Amino acid sequence: MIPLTPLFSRYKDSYLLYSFRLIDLLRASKSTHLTKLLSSQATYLYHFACLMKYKDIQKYEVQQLIEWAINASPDMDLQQFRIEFMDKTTELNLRSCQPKSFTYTFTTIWDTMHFLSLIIDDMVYTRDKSSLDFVMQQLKTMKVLFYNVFFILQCAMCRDHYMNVKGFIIYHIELIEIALDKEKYGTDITFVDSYQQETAGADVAVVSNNMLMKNLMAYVSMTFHNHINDYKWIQRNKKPPAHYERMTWGEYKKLLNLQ
Amino acid sequence: MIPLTPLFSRYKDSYLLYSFRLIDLLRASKSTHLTKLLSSQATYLYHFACIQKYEVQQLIEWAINASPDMDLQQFRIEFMDKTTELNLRSCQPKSFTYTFTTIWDTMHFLSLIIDDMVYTRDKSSLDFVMQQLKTMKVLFYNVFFILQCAMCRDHYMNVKGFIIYHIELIEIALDKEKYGTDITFVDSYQQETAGADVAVVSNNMLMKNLMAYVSMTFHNHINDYKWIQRNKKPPAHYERMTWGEYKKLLNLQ
Ligand SMILES: Cc1cc2nc3c(=O)[nH]c(=O)nc-3n(C[C@H](O)[C@H](O)[C@H](O)COP(=O)(O)OP(=O)(O)OC[C@H]3O[C@@H](n4cnc5c(N)ncnc54)[C@H](O)[C@@H]3O)c2cc1C
Ligand SMILES: Cc1cc2nc3c(=O)[nH]c(=O)nc-3n(C[C@H](O)[C@H](O)[C@H](O)COP(=O)(O)OP(=O)(O)OC[C@H]3O[C@@H](n4cnc5c(N)ncnc54)[C@H](O)[C@@H]3O)c2cc1C
Numbered sequence: 001m002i003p004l005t006p007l008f009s010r011y012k013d014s015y016l017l018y019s020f021r022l023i024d025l026l027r028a029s030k031s032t033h034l035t036k037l038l039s040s041q042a043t044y045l046y047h048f049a050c051l052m053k054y055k056d057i058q059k060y061e062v063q064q065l066i067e068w069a070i071n072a073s074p075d076m077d078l079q080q081f082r083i084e085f086m087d088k089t090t091e092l093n094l095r096s097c098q099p100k101s102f103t104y105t106f107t108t109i110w111d112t113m114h115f116l117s118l119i120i121d122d123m124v125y126t127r128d129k130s131s132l133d134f135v136m137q138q139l140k141t142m143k144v145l146f147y148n149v150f151f152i153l154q155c156a157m158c159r160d161h162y163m164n165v166k167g168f169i170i171y172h173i174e175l176i177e178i179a180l181d182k183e184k185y186g187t188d189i190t191f192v193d194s195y196q197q198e199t200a201g202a203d204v205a206v207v208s209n210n211m212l213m214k215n216l217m218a219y220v221s222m223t224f225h226n227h228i229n230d231y232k233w234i235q236r237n238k239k240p241p242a243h244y245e246r247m248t249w250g251e252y253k254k255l256l257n258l259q
Numbered sequence: 260m261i262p263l264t265p266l267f268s269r270y271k272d273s274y275l276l277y278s279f280r281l282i283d284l285l286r287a288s289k290s291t292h293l294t295k296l297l298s299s300q301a302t303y304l305y306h307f308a309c310i311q312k313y314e315v316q317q318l319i320e321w322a323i324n325a326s327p328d329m330d331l332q333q334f335r336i337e338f339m340d341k342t343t344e345l346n347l348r349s350c351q352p353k354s355f356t357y358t359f360t361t362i363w364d365t366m367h368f369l370s371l372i373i374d375d376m377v378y379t380r381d382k383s384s385l386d387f388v389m390q391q392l393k394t395m396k397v398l399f400y401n402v403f404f405i406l407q408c409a410m411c412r413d414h415y416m417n418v419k420g421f422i423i424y425h426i427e428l429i430e431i432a433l434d435k436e437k438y439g440t441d442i443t444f445v446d447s448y449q450q451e452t453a454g455a456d457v458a459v460v461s462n463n464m465l466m467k468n469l470m471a472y473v474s475m476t477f478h479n480h481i482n483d484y485k486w487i488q489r490n491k492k493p494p495a496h497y498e499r500m501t502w503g504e505y506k507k508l509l510n511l512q
Contacts, residue, residue: 147417164400165427167420171477174418174484181487196449202476203502207483207493223455227424230431239438240460248458 002122003257014111017099019045021152023069044141061092117217143170172220182210222252261375262510273364276352278304280405282322303394314345370470425473435463468511475505
């Protein structure tokens with residue numbers, strides 16, 4: 001599974017904060033259509049939180065927690081939902097889905113996207129080559145999760161930039177789907193250490209090749225992270241300042257102790 | 260300039276056909292929203308084929324008021340004449356067989372336009388090239404299908420950002436040049452991704468013919484995935500387009 005490091009536990013806590021803030025909104029859903037959309041996302045978010053923790057999605061326990069948050073008092077004040085959330089969560093033995101910190105920043109959102117990426121890379125590396133059925137389904141859920149990233153926070157240019165470029169991320173998830181599918185039909189995945197080797201092996205005329213960068217999604221999501229911060233200087237019409245430092249792959253791997 | 264080749268000629272005609280079929284839906288629009296968007300797309304589309312900006316402005320205002328009641332072969336006839344009335348024979352498609360290939364050809368044609376504009380940029384008119392890049396993203400964000408394939412549109416709307424991301428790379432590259440560092444053009448995608456793996460803004464590497472490579476790769480991806488979409492293994496005669504081959508077909512250097 002995934003290396004335990006300080007950053008990864010910030011990711012894990014940020015991710016539960018993001019989930020908690022998305023079920024909070026359930027209360028306020030004036031829209032039938034918005035309620036169902038949030039129900040599915042909250043379902044899926046806690047599915048992947050329980051999966052890594054209990055080794056089981058707990059479909060009927062999280063199903064309870066959703067009913068609750070939709071049928072919750074839609075006239076709370078911040079903590080007026082938090083309090084009973086802890087009260088609800090523990091009656092379902094889901095306390096390990098309670099966030100420790102509640103300060104919701106842009107890094108809550110980044111941490112959550114990086115978190116899901118590490119889950120995809122882990123699910124793929126620890127795949128049993130029989131229930132490819134399982135992993136391939138989760139990848140589909142992951143695309144659905146990255147497609148509907150709620151900001152909760154209000155930043156309209158962030159929201160419109162992402163809708164324009166998020167397909168960069170979803171594209172690489174689908175690369176993995178092609179890789180798992182090629183393995184189901186007898187061509188094992190050849191894991192490679194560089195994104196550039198995966199680029200080189202994609203440029204073939206036949207379908208018989210199957211290379212995939214190890215920790216693809218950690219690399220994709222970080223490159224994407226750099227890209228958003230690269231581009232914000234254009235939206236702001238400034239030269240990138242000297243204080244601006246970009247994440248390099250080798251340093252990112254070091255911080256999360258990836259091999 | 261873009262090399263004149265058989266494939267490139269087919270691209271330009273497919274592009275006119277796509278633009279023709281786009282304005283054919285102006286007369287059918289029952290929405291102020293959709294008329295504005297269709298007209299934006301059209302203005303951009305013909306702008307990138309041409310300036311005759313007033314002859315086009317009224318080719319479109321003609322397309323808005325054309326008879327809703329016509330069949331397609333009639334609108335064509337009326338369009339084939341308003342174009343000649345307008346000194347715009349160059350916008351007339353030669354074929355009208357509209358297929359998935361017409362859409363792909365249109366996406367590849369816009370890609371060659373991006374690469375050409377960037378490579379023949381002028382270090383003083385970067386403000387112009389960067390405003391063109393913003394128009395392109397709108398064209399790519401808004402790919403109408405005309406023909407109906409709901410999974411095609413659902414899929415495109417999920418991964419179209421792969422293409423738009425790479426347009427935004429070029430913008431980033433041009434901004435590092437407005438501020439002092441000239442673009443270096445590299446011959447492989449690998450080098451460009453290696454040059455972006457730096458902590459400090461010292462590099463400005465761009466793949467030459469990047470958007471052609473990007474649009475080719477993305478085209479292969481769509482076809483790669485259609486076999487998964489059909490619980491199937493791809494036929495033995497399926498052949499992915501390779502980069503060396505694609506440059507050979509368009510005489511790219
Ligand atoms: C989907 C999304 C879209 C956004 N779109 C825009 C936009 O369009 N315009 C705009 O101005 N802002 C946008 N933002 C916010 C922007 O990215 C930054 O969050 C903010 O502008 C600056 O915050 P910061 O200086 O703390 O850097 P941050 O990137 O927020 O730092 C947060 C954490 O991430 C670490 N980190 C930095 N880079 C990486 C990396 N490549 N990979 C992994 N970790 C990294 C940092 O060291 C730190 O731990 C977006 C954010 C998200 C999540
Ligand atoms: C945006 C878009 C999205 C689509 N999404 C789907 C989908 O989700 N599911 C589905 O089943 N179909 C989808 N299609 C249609 C699909 O891509 C094929 O076009 C279709 O299946 C017809 O098969 P074909 O072999 O005749 O087309 P193609 O093989 O794609 O024919 C296009 C022409 O251009 C050439 N060409 C082929 N590949 C490339 C390449 N990688 N780069 C440059 N040139 C190339 C070929 O020589 C051919 O002449 C999509 C099409 C478009 C334009």
